Ligand binder design. Sequence first.
Ligand SMILES: CC(C)Oc1cc(C(=O)NC2CCN(C)CC2)ccc1Nc1ccc2c(n1)N(C1CCCC1)[C@H](C)C(=O)N2C
Length: 128
Amino acid sequence: MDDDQVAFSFILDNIVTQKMMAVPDSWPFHHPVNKKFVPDYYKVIVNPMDLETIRKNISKHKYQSRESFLDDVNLILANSVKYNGPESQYTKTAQEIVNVCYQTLTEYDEHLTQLEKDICTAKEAALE
Ligand SMILES: CC(C)Oc1cc(C(=O)NC2CCN(C)CC2)ccc1Nc1ccc2c(n1)N(C1CCCC1)[C@H](C)C(=O)N2C
């Protein structure tokens, strides 16, 4: 029944919590940048993103496929390159967050593809 979307967001949340947030020294990417510490951030980064807000989107079942999800994770890296520069050590840990994310998704590719299909058919047929 409704379980398909909840299972999908469940697997997403855990990838974030137990594989992505586990990257060494990734804590600065766990939460929105605190303006108190980086006063220009929200002036040079126009679309902020972080793992906690991604989790909040997961709580609200924002992502129904891998792809809108990867959009937001990739954004975290895109944002680090603009603020910190392409070969900053902070950009490099964001890179690895992006990497372990893709690594996990392909591990569960066939499993997630099933979930993804059932959700789109439900959606597209809910409009009857
Ligand atoms: C400890 C210190 C080093 O950092 C922070 C500390 C704190 C801190 O203690 N907060 C607590 C909250 C609780 N209360 C009770 C006490 C205070 C917050 C942010 C720090 N820095 C930071 C964060 C993110 C980035 C970030 N820095 N950076 C780095 C690149 C250049 C600046 C540093 C950029 C903006 C970047 O992309 N990102 C994502």
